[PDB]
């Protein structure tokens, strides 16, 4: 069954059926076994596509709700925006459940532990986008902690040019600016990360250079936007 779920997940990606992919990957994870670099990526692509479409949907329905509150689509927008929010919360809870009960625990390489802790921080960040009061602050603490535990491992056992490290630092600085309300901690983090990787670009093969400079460009783009 496990190989068959991984196969149908590769097929679901090709047909651009990401909720199907998501279900095939969750089932592959649930088998209890560890994920290879490939499986780890299929799990990331599946859910990032599922939740990305739910986030973009939520952004539109909140935009319409804001306008209708500027006065009378109001009752229908709130019911439906809350419906799309519950579907989002459920997808993030499925991912966070897979991370906390199977993936983070059963992780060997520091590289895969940082990968899963970046995922954990990300899904708590998406949860915090739509959260409101009591729950919002508890989610923001859970996001910070997971991003911090990952930053520590990546600083201690990963090169500054590593794309997981760069991607983690990018997401954490996005967390600081957008969620945690700290633009200075975001600019400080983004500049530092860009500079450390820049210093060691001279030691990368064609493929690695392309993978690192892609995320480095996103770091500096955000820097341009925030300054």
């Amino acid at each position: 069954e496990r190989a068959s779920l991984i196969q149908k997940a590769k097929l679901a990606e090709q047909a651009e059926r990401y909720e199907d992919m998501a279900a095939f990957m969750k089932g592959a994870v649930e088998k209890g076994e560890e994920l290879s670099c490939e499986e780890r990526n299929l799990l990331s692509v599946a859910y990032k596509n599922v939740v990305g479409g739910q986030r973009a949907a939520w952004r539109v329905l909140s935009s319409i709700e804001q306008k209708s509150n500027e006065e009378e689509k109001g009752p229908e927008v709130r019911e439906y925006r809350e419906k799309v929010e519950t579907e989002l919360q459920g997808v993030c809870d499925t991912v966070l459940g897979l991370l906390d009960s199977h993936l983070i625990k059963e992780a060997g390489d520091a590289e895969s532990r940082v990968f899963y802790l970046k995922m954990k921080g990300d899904y708590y960040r998406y949860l915090a986008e739509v959260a409101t009061g009591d729950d919002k602050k508890r989610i923001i603490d859970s996001a910070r902690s997971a991003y911090q535990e990952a930053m520590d491992i990546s600083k201690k056992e990963m090169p500054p040019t590593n794309p997981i490290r760069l991607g983690l630092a990018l997401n954490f600085s996005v967390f600081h600016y957008e969620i945690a309300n700290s633009p200075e901690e975001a600019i400080s983090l983004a500049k530092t990360t860009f500079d450390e990787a820049m210093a060691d670009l001279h030691t990368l093969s064609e493929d690695s250079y392309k993978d690192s400079t892609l995320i480095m460009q996103l770091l500096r783009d955000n820097l341009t936007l925030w300054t």
């Binding site: 692509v45 990032k48 794309p163 996005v174 892609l214 783009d221």
Partner: peptide, 8 residues
């Protein structure tokens, strides 16, 4: 609009 880490 800001950017976050891309898909692996």
């Amino acid at each position: 609009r800001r950017a976050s880490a891309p898909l692996p």
